[PDB]
PDB file of N, CA, C and O in Angstrom:
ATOM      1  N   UNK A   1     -39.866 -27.839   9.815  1.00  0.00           N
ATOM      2  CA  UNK A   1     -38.919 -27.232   8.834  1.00  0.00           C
ATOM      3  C   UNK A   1     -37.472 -27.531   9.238  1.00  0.00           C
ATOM      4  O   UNK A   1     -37.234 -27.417  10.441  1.00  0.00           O
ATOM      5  N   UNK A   2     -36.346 -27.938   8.335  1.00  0.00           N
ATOM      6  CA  UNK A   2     -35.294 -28.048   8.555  1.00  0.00           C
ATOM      7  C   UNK A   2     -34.368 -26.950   8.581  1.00  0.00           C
ATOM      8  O   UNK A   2     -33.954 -26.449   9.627  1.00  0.00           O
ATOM      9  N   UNK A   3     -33.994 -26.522   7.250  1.00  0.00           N
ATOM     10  CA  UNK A   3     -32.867 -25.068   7.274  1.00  0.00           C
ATOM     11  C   UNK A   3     -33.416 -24.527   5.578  1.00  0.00           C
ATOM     12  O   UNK A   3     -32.809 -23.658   4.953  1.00  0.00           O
ATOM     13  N   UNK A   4     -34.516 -25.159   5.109  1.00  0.00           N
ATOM     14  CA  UNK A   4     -34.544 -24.954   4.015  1.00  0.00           C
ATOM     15  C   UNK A   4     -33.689 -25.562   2.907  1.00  0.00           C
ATOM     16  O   UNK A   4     -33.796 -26.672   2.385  1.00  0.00           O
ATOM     17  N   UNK A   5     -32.898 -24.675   2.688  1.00  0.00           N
ATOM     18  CA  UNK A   5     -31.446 -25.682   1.902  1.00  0.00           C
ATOM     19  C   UNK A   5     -31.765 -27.050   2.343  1.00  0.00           C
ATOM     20  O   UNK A   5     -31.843 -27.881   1.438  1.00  0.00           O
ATOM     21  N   UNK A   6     -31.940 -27.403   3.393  1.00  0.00           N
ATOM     22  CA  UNK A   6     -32.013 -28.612   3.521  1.00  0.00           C
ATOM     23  C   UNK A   6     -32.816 -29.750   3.519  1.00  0.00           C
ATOM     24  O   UNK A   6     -32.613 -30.879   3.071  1.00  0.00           O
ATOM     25  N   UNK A   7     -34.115 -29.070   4.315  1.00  0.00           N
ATOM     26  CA  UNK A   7     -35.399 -29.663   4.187  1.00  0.00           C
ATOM     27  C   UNK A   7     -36.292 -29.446   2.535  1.00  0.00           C
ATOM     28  O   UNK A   7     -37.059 -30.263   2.027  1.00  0.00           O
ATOM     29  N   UNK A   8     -35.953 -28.327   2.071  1.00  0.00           N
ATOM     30  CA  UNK A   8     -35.931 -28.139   0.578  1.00  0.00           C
ATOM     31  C   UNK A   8     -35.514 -28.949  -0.125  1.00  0.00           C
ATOM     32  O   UNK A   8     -36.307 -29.714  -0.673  1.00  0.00           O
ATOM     33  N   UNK A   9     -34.112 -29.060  -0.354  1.00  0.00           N
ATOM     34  CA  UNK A   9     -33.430 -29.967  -1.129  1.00  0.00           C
ATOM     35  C   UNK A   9     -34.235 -31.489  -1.031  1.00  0.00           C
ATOM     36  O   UNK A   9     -34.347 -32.284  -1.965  1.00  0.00           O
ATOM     37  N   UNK A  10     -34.773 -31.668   0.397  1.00  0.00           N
ATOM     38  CA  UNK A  10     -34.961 -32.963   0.480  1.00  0.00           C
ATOM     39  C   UNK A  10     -36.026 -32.978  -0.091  1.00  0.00           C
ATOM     40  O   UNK A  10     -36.376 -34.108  -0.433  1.00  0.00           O
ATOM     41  N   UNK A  11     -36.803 -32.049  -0.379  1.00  0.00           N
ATOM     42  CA  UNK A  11     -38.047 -32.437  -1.238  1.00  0.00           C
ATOM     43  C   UNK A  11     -37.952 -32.229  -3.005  1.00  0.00           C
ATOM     44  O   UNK A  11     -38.422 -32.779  -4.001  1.00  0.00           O
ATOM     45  N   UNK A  12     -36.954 -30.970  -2.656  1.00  0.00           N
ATOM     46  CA  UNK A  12     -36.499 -30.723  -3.832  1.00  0.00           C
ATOM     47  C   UNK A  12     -35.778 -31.527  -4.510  1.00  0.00           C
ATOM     48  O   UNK A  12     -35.510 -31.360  -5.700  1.00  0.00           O
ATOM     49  N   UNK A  13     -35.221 -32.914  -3.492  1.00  0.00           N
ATOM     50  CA  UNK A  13     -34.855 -34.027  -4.217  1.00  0.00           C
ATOM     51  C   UNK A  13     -35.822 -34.658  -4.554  1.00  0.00           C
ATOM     52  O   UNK A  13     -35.628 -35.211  -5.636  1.00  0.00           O
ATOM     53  N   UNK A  14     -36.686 -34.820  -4.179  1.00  0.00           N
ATOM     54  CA  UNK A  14     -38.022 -35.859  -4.376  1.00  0.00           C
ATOM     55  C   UNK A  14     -38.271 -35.792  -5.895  1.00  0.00           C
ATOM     56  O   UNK A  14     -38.253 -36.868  -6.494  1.00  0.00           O
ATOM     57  N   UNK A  15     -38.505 -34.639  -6.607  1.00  0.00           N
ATOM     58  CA  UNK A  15     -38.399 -34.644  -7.501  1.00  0.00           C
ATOM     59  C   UNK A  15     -37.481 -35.017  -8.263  1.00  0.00           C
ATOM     60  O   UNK A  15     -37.754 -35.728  -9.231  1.00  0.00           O
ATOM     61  N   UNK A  16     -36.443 -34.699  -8.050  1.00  0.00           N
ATOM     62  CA  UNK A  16     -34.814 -34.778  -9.144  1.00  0.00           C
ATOM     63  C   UNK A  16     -34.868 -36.368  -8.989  1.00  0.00           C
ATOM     64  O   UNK A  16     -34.497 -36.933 -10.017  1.00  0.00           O
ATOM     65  N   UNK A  17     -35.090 -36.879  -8.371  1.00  0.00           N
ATOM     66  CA  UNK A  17     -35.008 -38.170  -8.387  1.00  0.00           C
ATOM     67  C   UNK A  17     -36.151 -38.940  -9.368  1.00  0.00           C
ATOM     68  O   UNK A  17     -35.956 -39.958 -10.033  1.00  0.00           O
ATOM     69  N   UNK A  18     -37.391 -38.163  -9.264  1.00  0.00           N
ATOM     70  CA  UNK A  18     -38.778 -38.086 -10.037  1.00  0.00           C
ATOM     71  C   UNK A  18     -38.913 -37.854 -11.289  1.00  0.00           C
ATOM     72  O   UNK A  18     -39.183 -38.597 -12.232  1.00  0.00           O
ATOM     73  N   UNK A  19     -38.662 -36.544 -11.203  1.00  0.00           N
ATOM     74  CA  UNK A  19     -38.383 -35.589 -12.351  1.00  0.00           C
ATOM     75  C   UNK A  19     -37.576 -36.301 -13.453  1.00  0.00           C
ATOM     76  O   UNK A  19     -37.836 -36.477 -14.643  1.00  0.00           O
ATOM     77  N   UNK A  20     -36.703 -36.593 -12.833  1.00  0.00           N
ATOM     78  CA  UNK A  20     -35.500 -36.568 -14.250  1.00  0.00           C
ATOM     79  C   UNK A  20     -35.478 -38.365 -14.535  1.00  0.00           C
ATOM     80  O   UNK A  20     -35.384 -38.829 -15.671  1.00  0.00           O
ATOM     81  N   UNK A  21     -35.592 -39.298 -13.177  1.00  0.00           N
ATOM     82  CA  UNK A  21     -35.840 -40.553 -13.515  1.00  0.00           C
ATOM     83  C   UNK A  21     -36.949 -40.984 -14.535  1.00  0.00           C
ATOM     84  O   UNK A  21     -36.813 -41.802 -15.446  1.00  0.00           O
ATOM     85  N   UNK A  22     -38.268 -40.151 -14.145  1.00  0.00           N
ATOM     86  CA  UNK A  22     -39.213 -40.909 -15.033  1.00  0.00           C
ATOM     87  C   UNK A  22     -39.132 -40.855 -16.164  1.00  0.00           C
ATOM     88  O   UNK A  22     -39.630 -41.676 -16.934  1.00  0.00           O
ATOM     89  N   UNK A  23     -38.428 -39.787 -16.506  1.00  0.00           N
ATOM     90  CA  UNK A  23     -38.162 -39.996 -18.352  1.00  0.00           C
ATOM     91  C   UNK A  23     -37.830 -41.162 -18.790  1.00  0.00           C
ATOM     92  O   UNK A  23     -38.585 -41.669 -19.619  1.00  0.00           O
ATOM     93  N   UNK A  24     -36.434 -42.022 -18.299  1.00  0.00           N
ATOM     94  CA  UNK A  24     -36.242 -42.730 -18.928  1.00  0.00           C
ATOM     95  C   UNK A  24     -37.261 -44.281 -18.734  1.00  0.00           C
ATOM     96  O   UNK A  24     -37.182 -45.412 -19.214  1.00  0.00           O
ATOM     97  N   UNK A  25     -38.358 -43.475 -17.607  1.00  0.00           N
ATOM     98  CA  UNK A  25     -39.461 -44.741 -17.776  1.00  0.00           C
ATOM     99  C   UNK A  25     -40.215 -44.610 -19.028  1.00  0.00           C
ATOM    100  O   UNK A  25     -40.668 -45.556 -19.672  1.00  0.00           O
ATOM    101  N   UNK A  26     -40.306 -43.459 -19.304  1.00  0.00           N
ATOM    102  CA  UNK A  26     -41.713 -43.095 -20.718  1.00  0.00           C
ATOM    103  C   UNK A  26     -41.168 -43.694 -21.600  1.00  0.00           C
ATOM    104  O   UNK A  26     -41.607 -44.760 -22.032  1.00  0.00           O
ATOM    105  N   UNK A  27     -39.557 -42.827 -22.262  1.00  0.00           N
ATOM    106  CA  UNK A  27     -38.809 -43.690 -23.236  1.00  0.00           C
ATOM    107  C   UNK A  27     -38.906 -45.102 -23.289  1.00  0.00           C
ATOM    108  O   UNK A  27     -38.809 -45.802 -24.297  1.00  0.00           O
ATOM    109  N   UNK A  28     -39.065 -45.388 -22.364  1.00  0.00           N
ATOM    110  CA  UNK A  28     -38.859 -47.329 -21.978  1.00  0.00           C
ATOM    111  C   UNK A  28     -40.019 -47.938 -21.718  1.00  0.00           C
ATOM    112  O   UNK A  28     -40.163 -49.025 -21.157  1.00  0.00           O
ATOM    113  N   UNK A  29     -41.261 -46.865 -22.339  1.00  0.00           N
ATOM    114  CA  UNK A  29     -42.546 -47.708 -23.344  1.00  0.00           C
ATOM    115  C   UNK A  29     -42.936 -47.058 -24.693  1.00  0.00           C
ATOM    116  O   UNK A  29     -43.896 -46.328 -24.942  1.00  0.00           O
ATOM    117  N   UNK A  30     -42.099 -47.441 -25.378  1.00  0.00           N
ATOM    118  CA  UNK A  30     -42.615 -46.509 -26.747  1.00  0.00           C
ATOM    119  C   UNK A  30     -42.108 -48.006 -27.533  1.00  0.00           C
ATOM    120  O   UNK A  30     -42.819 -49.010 -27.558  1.00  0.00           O
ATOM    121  N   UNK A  31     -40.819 -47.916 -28.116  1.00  0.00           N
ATOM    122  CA  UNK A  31     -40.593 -49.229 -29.077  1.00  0.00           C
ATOM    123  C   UNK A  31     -40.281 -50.274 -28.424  1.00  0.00           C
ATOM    124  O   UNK A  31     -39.405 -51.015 -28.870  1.00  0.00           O
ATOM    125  N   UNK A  32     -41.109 -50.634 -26.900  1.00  0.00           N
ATOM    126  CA  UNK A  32     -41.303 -51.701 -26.194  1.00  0.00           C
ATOM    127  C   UNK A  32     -42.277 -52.531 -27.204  1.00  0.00           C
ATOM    128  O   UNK A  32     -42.817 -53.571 -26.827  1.00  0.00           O
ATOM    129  N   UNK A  33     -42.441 -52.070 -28.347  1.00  0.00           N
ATOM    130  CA  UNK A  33     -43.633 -53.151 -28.562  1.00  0.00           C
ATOM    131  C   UNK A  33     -42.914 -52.912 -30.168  1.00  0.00           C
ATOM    132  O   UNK A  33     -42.685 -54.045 -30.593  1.00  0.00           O
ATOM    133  N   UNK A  34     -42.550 -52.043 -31.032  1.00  0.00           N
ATOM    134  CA  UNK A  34     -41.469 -51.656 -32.052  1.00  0.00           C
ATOM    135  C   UNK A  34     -42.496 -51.713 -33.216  1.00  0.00           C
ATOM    136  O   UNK A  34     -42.255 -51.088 -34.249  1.00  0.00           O
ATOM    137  N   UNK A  35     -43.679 -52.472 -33.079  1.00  0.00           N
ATOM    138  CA  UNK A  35     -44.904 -52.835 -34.529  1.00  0.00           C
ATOM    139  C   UNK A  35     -45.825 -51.830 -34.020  1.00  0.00           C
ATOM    140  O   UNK A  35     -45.419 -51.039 -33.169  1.00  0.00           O
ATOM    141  N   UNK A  36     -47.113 -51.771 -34.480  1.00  0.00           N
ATOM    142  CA  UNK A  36     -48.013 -50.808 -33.621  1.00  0.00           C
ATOM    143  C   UNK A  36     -48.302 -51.118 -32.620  1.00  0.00           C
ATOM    144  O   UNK A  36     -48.686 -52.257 -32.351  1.00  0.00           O
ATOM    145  N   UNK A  37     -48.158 -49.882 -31.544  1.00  0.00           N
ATOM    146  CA  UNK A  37     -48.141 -49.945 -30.417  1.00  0.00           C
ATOM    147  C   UNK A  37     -50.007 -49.775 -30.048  1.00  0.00           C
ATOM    148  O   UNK A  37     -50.411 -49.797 -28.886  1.00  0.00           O
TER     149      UNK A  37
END
């Protein structure tokens, strides 16, 4: 364990980095193909 705040954050970054990045992966297969997908 770190301090929490800290060792937290660092996981709690894991996500934010996860979390909020992969969206713009999903978005960025939908009208990848624009006819039926």
């Amino acid at each position: 364990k770190c301090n929490t705040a800290t060792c937290a954050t660092q996981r709690l970054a894991n996500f934010l980095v996860h979390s909020s990045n992969n969206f713009g992966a999903i978005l960025s297969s939908t009208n990848v193909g624009s006819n039926t997908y």
